[PDB]
Swiss-Prot record, chain A:
Region of the whole protein represented: 1 to 151 of 701
Protein name (record): Protein transport protein TIP20
Protein role: Required for protein transport between the Golgi and the endoplasmic reticulum. May contribute to tethering of coatomer-coated retrograde transport vesicles to the ER membrane through interaction with and stabilization of the SNARE complex.
Source organism per UniProt: Saccharomyces cerevisiae (strain ATCC 204508 / S288c)
Gene name, Swiss-Prot/TrEMBL: TIP20
Subunit description: Component of a peripheral membrane protein complex consisting of DSL1, SEC39/DSL3 and TIP20. Bound to a SNARE complex consisting of UFE1, USE1, SEC20 and SEC22 or YKT6 through direct interaction of TIP20 with SEC20. Interacts with DSL1, SEC39/DSL3 and the cytoplasmic domain of SEC20.
Compartments, record wording: Endoplasmic reticulum membrane
Misc remark: Present with 6020 molecules/cell in log phase SD medium.
Curated annotation (Swiss-Prot), chain B:
Part of the full-length chain shown: 1 to 114 of 754
Signal peptide segment: none
Subunit organization: Component of a peripheral membrane protein complex consisting of DSL1, SEC39/DSL3 and TIP20. Bound to a SNARE complex consisting of UFE1, USE1, SEC20 and SEC22 or YKT6 through direct interaction of TIP20 with SEC20. Binds the coatomer complex through direct interaction with RET2/COPD and RET1/COPA. Binds TIP20 and SEC39/DSL3.
Originating species: Saccharomyces cerevisiae (strain ATCC 204508 / S288c)
Intrachain S-S bonds: none
Role played: Required for protein transport between the Golgi and the endoplasmic reticulum. May tether coatomer-coated retrograde transport vesicles to the ER membrane through interaction with coatomer as well as the SNARE complex. May contribute to the stabilization of the SNARE complex.
Taxonomy, superkingdom: Eukaryota
Other facts noted in the record for this chain: Present with 8970 molecules/cell in log phase SD medium.
Protein name per Swiss-Prot or TrEMBL: Protein transport protein DSL1
Length: 151, 114
């Protein structure tokens, strides 16, 4: 405030110092949030982490997580192991159907087959093997699938 | 199997990179500066608070000047008298005026005289 034209803009200067006080209240709120983050133990709790811990312990709970709370990488690994289980299960069912077809053709006289018949069946079974990606997980349910598949 | 999960710390950290969840790691290392940062920020806050206080206490002056000027523009000429009277009385008595610099009061005097 130096001249009359400073009073003519003392309302403008009011807005300037209002913006200054707003920037400074934002700096003080930001600084209070920073004083908070200096404790490992604060108002910003494990709320999304709590939803991941409480509800995430289920595949459906994880679907709820990623749909409502949000998707993270463990969701991705869980959909990966779930699609692994579904691929191994569809493989169980498909090699089971294939085994039933083999057991059907079992007493079809082997003259009644063709190099193209066996070729088609082998292409089928190679594809069915291909429907099962290799996943380096310690056998928890892959073991029974492996037994049935080898059988 | 597939249903087992880590602690609170690692999930919070994953949330922290996750742009959906931000903590405030910006001033975790400022332990010997956070106090006096808050101190000088609150000091500048009280300074700006009383400054804005003085500034709208003098927006009263700007307001009354725009007021008297408009009154000229409407040729009131009587509440013009009362209003310059009030303005002078305030300039003399308004402590805000009494705490202003010399030149601002100079300009105010000049304008009100004009």
């Amino acid at each position: 405030m130096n001249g009359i034209d400073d009073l003519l803009n003392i309302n403008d200067r009011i807005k300037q110092v209002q913006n200054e006080r707003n920037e400074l209240a934002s700096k003080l709120q930001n600084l209070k949030q920073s004083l908070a983050s200096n404790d490992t133990e604060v108002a910003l709790s494990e709320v999304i982490a709590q939803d991941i811990i409480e509800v995430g312990a289920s595949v459906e709970g994880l679907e709820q997580l990623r749909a409502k709370y949000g998707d993270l990488q463990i969701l991705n690994k869980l959909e990966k192991v779930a699609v692994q289980q579904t691929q191994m299960q569809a493989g169980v069912d498909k090699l089971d159907s294939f085994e039933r077809q083999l057991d059907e053709l079992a007493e079809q006289p082997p003259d009644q087959f063709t190099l193209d018949d066996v070729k088609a069946l082998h292409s089928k079974l190679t594809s069915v093997f291909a429907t099962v990606p290799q996943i380096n997980n310690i056998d928890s349910q892959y073991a029974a699938y492996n037994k049935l598949k080898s059988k | 199997m597939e249903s087992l999960f880590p602690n609170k710390g690692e999930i919070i950290r994953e949330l922290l990179k996750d742009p959906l969840i931000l903590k405030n790691d910006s001033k975790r290392s400022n332990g010997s500066e956070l106090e006096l940062d808050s101190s000088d920020l609150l000091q500048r806050e009280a300074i700006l608070a009383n400054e804005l206080n003085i500034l709208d206490n003098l927006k009263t002056f700007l307001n009354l000047i725009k007021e008297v000027k408009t009154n000229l523009n409407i040729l009131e000429l009587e509440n013009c008298y009362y209003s310059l009277q009030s303005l002078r009385k305030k300039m003399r008595n308004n402590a805000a005026y009494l705490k202003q610099s010399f030149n601002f009061q100079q300009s105010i005097s000049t304008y009100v005289d004009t």
